[PDB]
Amino acid sequence: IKVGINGFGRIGRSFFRASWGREEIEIVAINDLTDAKHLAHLLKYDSVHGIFKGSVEAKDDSIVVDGKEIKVFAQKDPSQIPWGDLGVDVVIEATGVFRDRENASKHLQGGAKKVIITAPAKNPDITVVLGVNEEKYNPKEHNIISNASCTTNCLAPCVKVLNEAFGVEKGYMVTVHAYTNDQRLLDLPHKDFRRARAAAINIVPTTTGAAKAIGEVIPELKGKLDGTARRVPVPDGSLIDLTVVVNKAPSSVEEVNEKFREAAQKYRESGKVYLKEILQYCEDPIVSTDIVGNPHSAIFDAPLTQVIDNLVHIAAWYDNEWGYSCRLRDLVIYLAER
Amino acid sequence: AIKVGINGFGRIGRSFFRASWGREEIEIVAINDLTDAKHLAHLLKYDSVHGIFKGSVEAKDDSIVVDGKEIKVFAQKDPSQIPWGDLGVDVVIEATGVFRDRENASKHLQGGAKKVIITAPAKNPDITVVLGVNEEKYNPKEHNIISNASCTTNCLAPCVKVLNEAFGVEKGYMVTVHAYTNDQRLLDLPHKDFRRARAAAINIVPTTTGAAKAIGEVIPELKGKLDGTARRVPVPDGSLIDLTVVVNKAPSSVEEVNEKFREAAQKYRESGKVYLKEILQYCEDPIVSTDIVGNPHSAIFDAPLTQVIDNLVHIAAWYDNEWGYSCRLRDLVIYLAER
Ligand SMILES: NC(=O)c1ccc[n+]([C@@H]2O[C@H](COP(=O)([O-])OP(=O)(O)OC[C@H]3O[C@@H](n4cnc5c(N)ncnc54)[C@H](O)[C@@H]3O)[C@@H](O)[C@H]2O)c1
Ligand SMILES: NC(=O)c1ccc[n+]([C@@H]2O[C@H](COP(=O)([O-])OP(=O)(O)OC[C@H]3O[C@@H](n4cnc5c(N)ncnc54)[C@H](O)[C@@H]3O)[C@@H](O)[C@H]2O)c1
């Protein structure tokens, strides 16, 4: 499948790296707000994920990665991108400013057959989280797809295991999340009064729609969960803390953990390539740097599980950039299959 | 004024010194650590988080002079070797972090001190106190080894007390996003705790806390009702608790929850008790960790972060783990004097 990337940023470039070398995907065009030389350099040297292994060459209006020539554009207006004449099937909308339906749909009016919004969206045709509700996707009816947020891809699978096993009545989630470019280096103007504050020297409370909008991927949990985020000084790597009240009080912490061990095993034996890196059952005492580069949507930290009668608490890690980008890679692959 | 001695002139020991300096109620006369007066004076003068010390600090061979007042300095790793008795010290602040056990902490008493305050949770202390929660349980005649609990307990206890008296806590969980401390490592190094062994300034480090589990020591009825955990993050100071509780009487709205906190804060202030003036602060401005660095309250309630779903209530409160706790130590010393 031909792929176009709009917004070659943290997610865009991680998506490029995640799907490179995979014969199922063929990235043919990239669009951002700079020249080819700057994009090539950003792709080669990453402060968080290391040096790109392939060979990167820059040209006037394109980059050649491992002999493959990829067209580079610098159109701030998405309607000006010729996805159609490039033979692009799917476009990865990762600029962060076109999460609305009318702007995201411009890519279609440009020759794209489908657009994937790398974030929660308002009025998309369908929001999908691999390993949770990807089957509710209908090729002919859905052209604007949201892959939700990094947080949702970690939260949904975990709450799914807890719900099917014990029945979640209500819950709350706090995510200790790495800072991102939607925050500021030093106190600067920003719509959100807190996201405006120096990111690398502050614990920054901010909102997240992961729990509140969980209803989009798991209908029966709608209005059952609330959540929030705490942005902290790590360049990448995040963790979710989920507390739920269940109908079936588990007999112990180990009964809860077993359910996760089994859910992870189930995904791996499904035979679906797009479900192989959804859930990882971990028992080693790790910290954020250990999961940087981990492709799973959720790395369940068994030792952190706690239970008080019908109150259940679990924690799961997720490389907010990498795991999510790998899900984007798997979502593109899934579309190929239909 | 009560004569005070400090054992362990570290983050807490020095912050305690700064917080109680100028206060006529307290008089610090001796300090013990593991280095010379010169190094201590310099550490006191220049702080990476709390700025330059206001008073004038001078170093001598066996002491430091702060604003013209001489303060004997010792370097005895074994607490039994400190002459608190000859110095006339009434209360000793045990802040080395390694003498939390009763038999070790009581060594200060055998040295002449009348009372000891362990700057952390402890096993078998005469009592564990949290100002604004159970200080009235203190008995001047039976309590000589006092635990001031942890920085987290001092934030958690006051907040759950509000929620319990207003709606009744059936059970809950607490997660605290906490600044890193000296019990962690700068770069991956051997440590009893596999995670606290990891580079603190570049990791989100999960670790245990007894704040919730041991809450019963300051609020007996909540014993076994709360559990919690900690997430150490790359911030040199400044922490935040996130508490979720299931209550008996579901609140009508978020505002009703916030109102209880606004009222609890007010009640502390018009209590007239000097030691309860900075227990709780009701805040409505959208702040971040650096905004509470230097804030003396045990808990800075962040009203805008409150959420409610049926009988599930969630609140968040900040606390300068070094400063707030230290001011509580200052207030505790004053409280002891008032008895
Ligand atoms: N950072 C994460 O971990 C993460 C995880 C999940 C989802 N997301 C979402 O992905 C999106 C992008 O995230 P990001 O972290 O990579 O941010 P980013 O700042 O790195 O932005 C991506 C790129 O978009 C380019 N861009 C901006 N406006 C453009 C325009 N009009 N035309 C073309 N290119 C344009 C920028 O120059 C940049 O290179 C956001 O909606 C974000 O919420 C981010
Ligand atoms: N950092 C916080 O926010 C915080 C909050 C609440 C309670 N506490 C508790 O206070 C205690 C000290 O904390 P800290 O953060 O200041 O740590 P710290 O390491 O910075 O302070 C310890 C000080 O004790 C001295 N010391 C060590 N062994 C000694 C000995 N045998 N004799 C004399 N001096 C000795 C050291 O030289 C050092 O200056 C700990 O028990 C800690 O858990 C810390």
UniProtKB/Swiss-Prot annotation, chain A:
Active site per the UniProt annotation: 150
Statement: the UniProt record of this protein carries the keyword Transmembrane helix: no
Cystine pairings recorded for this chain: none
Keyword annotations of the record: Cytoplasm, Glycolysis, NAD, Nucleotide-binding, Oxidoreductase
Subcellular location(s) of the protein: Cytoplasm
SUPFAM superfamilies to which the protein is assigned, alphabetical: Glyceraldehyde-3-phosphate dehydrogenase-like, C-terminal domain, NAD(P)-binding Rossmann-fold domains
Binding sites annotated in the UniProt record for NAD(+): 10-11, 32, 76, 118, 181, 320
Record site feature (Activates thiol group during catalysis), residues: 177
Gene Ontology biological-process entries: glucose metabolic process; glycolytic process
Sites where the protein binds D-glyceraldehyde 3-phosphate: 149-151, 180, 195, 208-209, 231
Reactions performed catalytically: D-glyceraldehyde 3-phosphate + phosphate + NAD(+) = (2R)-3-phospho-glyceroyl phosphate + NADH + H(+)
MF GO annotations: glyceraldehyde-3-phosphate dehydrogenase (NAD+) (phosphorylating) activity; NAD binding; NADP binding
Biological or metabolic pathway of the protein: Carbohydrate degradation; glycolysis; pyruvate from D-glyceraldehyde 3-phosphate: step 1/5
Primary location group: cytoplasm
UniProt key word NAD: yes
CC annotations in GO: cytoplasm
One Pfam family this sequence matches: Gp_dh_N
Family annotation (InterPro entries): GlycerAld/Erythrose_P_DH, GlycerAld_3-P_DH_AS, GlycerAld_3-P_DH_cat, GlycerAld_3-P_DH_NAD(P)-bd, Glyceraldehyde-3-P_DH_1, NAD(P)-bd_dom_sf
EC numbers, comma separated: 1.2.1.12
Subunit structure and binding partners: Homotetramer.
Family from the record: Belongs to the glyceraldehyde-3-phosphate dehydrogenase family.
Job of this protein: Catalyzes the oxidative phosphorylation of glyceraldehyde 3-phosphate (G3P) to 1,3-bisphosphoglycerate (BPG) using the cofactor NAD. The first reaction step involves the formation of a hemiacetal intermediate between G3P and a cysteine residue, and this hemiacetal intermediate is then oxidized to a thioester, with concomitant reduction of NAD to NADH. The reduced NADH is then exchanged with the second NAD, and the thioester is attacked by a nucleophilic inorganic phosphate to produce BPG.
Protein name in UniProt: Glyceraldehyde-3-phosphate dehydrogenase
